[PDB]
Amino acid sequence: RPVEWVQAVVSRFDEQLPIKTHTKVSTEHNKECLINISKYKFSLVISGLTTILKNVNNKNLYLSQLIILDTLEKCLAGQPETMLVKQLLPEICHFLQHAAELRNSASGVLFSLSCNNFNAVFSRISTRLQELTVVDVHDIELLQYINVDCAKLKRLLKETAFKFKALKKVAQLAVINSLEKAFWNWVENYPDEFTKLYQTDMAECAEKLFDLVDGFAESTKRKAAVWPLQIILLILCPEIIQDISKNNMNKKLFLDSLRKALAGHGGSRQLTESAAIACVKLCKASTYISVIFLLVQSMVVDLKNLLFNPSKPFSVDLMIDCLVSCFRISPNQHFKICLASPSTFHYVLVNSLHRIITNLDWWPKIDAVYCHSVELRNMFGETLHKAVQGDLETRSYKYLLLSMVKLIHADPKLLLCNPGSTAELITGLVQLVPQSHMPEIAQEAMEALLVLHQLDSIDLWPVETFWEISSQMLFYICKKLTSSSTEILKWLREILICRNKFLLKNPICRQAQTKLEVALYMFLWNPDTEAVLVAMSCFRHLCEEADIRCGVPNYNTFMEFASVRAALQKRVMALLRRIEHPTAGNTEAWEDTHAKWEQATKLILSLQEWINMTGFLCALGGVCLTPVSKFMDRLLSLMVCNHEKVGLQIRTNVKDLVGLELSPALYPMLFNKLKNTISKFFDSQGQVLLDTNTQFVEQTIAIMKNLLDNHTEGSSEHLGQASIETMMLNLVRYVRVLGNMVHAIQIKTKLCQLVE
């Protein structure tokens, strides 16, 4: 019965789609199992996914389709024909901000499909070409996406050339654009095959199609449309390029027209703009390799004077393609222009460098650029300064800064290698992490700082530098955290992992460790459950740091945090009570939380945060044994909180938190303060001063009952330290003078239950 269980995995995966944490893990685990099943029973899994995709097609819809298409792509990329062609391929055609993601995903699916399927996708394309000869072009666009090799490219060109004159003008246009991408698809995937082309049937197809496409070009607009393909088709004819460098006359007149259009002598802006696109594509093509270099040398200077002119800016992806190509051709005049200049040039430079890192054996590596690191650092500092001090100009500095941080994520080594310099760089990134108005930048600054904290990076900043800089970052981040906090805290966990790794290979440090300790304790009360769990995880790394340092007080309780909404807060408070030993950190965390809590209390007189802060103060406060005395007096004043909208909730939560969660080491202070307060309810003749006092007494009885019910280990030791006798006598004496009404009877009953 294997088929039946494969279908059960497929059916599980379908029902777990968003359109219909554990469901995330289950979904990914199912997807990964389907992929690994597809590695063998490929058509069962693909059929199921196809069937699901049909059903789904007939925010959560897009996410479901993305999950299905990502699964399909990874299955197809793992492939060791009929329904691929008759069932899947039409659905992938149907797909061809989430629409662009879906188009990208579907294209990756189609690319993967096409690798082993090509003859079928080409048969669909060839059939629509035939239909177009006797206008709906969408199947022709599939040529953009499909995997193409040298033999397949030759076939596509041959099929096209034969039919091209019989096609309608809109179909001819769709073909022209689509073949331009199809050429690039081959060159990018199979650079070795393009290199071999420069080391006659392809050239015959390319020349035939060139002359056909030239015959189509009857107007300025059609000329501008075809020139990017005509340069490709000419690049597919190395021997024609060699002849026209000295039947070919129209190819020479085309290159001359491109030169004239780059040099500004063509009046038509559309032809100059198109000529830029064509000559960038030529420059690009040369990097994947020859006579082509002479053609590049004839146009590159005019192309640079078109795209990189600070006095007359062109009208970014095209400029990036140009700069990357120029760098690959010769690894810097236009580079210095981009370092100096319009912010759009800074943008194009940085994105070009990022592409150079992230995208062949003869291509120059990024390391030639490590002469310009000082200028890149200056550009970063300036851009940072301009983004923070900030409408259209401001928005442009944001996109630039994001790109510079992405560049730092792509490679730190550049910045560090030419060079305080490192401290400035890290400080600037660190300054972005807090910024609420730029979440995308902050996220990337964190990733950048993380890769800057990997071993190989730190060496380039060693140990005396690591300590100073990394602690300064920690101290600053923690100081902000104690003033997207959750994501910053996750990242701070991975930074601590990196620090532990760096020390395992091995005054601001004490300050940083203390502020970190403060921050982590302050996260234990945070209203976000995820934040609390992450903070717990951070104590593990604080312990690991100390193990690594010491191997050359709280540690047991930190390891218990590491081992771990209302249930979690209860568990946290139970652990906080087990902190016996004072530290600068825990003390300061208590004082800061107390200060915040007093401010929040005034504002209240957000509630769940105040409850959690209250609980934390109650649980940790023993370490501080004054500020604690004042907090306890304030809690006692809140037991009788008369506030109309939040008073019941305040009284209930103070009662429950004092009664279940207070530190055992504070019981001696609590009983003295309760005693002293209740004693004020009597005059000098020992008569009872009878609503506030009655309410205090009821809450006191419940609080004391809850304390005495509690079996927290070590609580017995502290219960002994202060006498209850005068307090309990005063409680019963107070309750005796309450009349025989229902509420007073309940209070008498509760006091009996306390006494028991």
């Binding site: 294997p2 289950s26 099943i37």
Partner: protein, 125 residues
């Protein structure tokens, strides 16, 4: 010996079929994932037993630890998809193994009556 592999597998599968404790199931399915990869030619025997519960755990469950073995078994099965059907246990007399070890008379009792009476008549004078 494939009979010993089949018996071992059938016992583990029997223990999965019935036990309600998810912690038992973690241990057992981890051993079935290795055992499937180890004894792939014999593994088909157990498939009938596993089929009902594996459908149930795939469609229902949300523990990754238990699912990791289950997905491993399905992958292993498909990867090696036979030389021994469920009938193979019947040939040597074990088709009842998963039968009997399920949850809690006449036909069995009459044979036991004859057996006990024969036990007495052989052993007791």
């Amino acid at each position: 010996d494939p009979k010993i592999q089949a018996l071992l597998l059938t016992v583990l599968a029997t223990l999965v079929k019935y036990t309600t404790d998810e912690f038992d199931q973690r241990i057992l399915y981890e051993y079935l994932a290795e055992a499937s990869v180890v004894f792939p030619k014999v593994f088909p025997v157990v498939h009938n037993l596993l089929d009902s519960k594996i459908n149930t755990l795939l469609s229902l469950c949300q523990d990754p630890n238990l699912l990791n073995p289950i997905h491993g078994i399905v992958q292993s099965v498909v990867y090696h998809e036979p030389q021994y059907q469920t009938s193979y246990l019947q040939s040597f007399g074990f088709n009842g193994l998963w039968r009997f070890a399920g949850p809690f008379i006449p036909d069995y009792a009459e044979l036991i009556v004859k057996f006990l009476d024969a036990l007495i008549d052989t052993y007791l004078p």
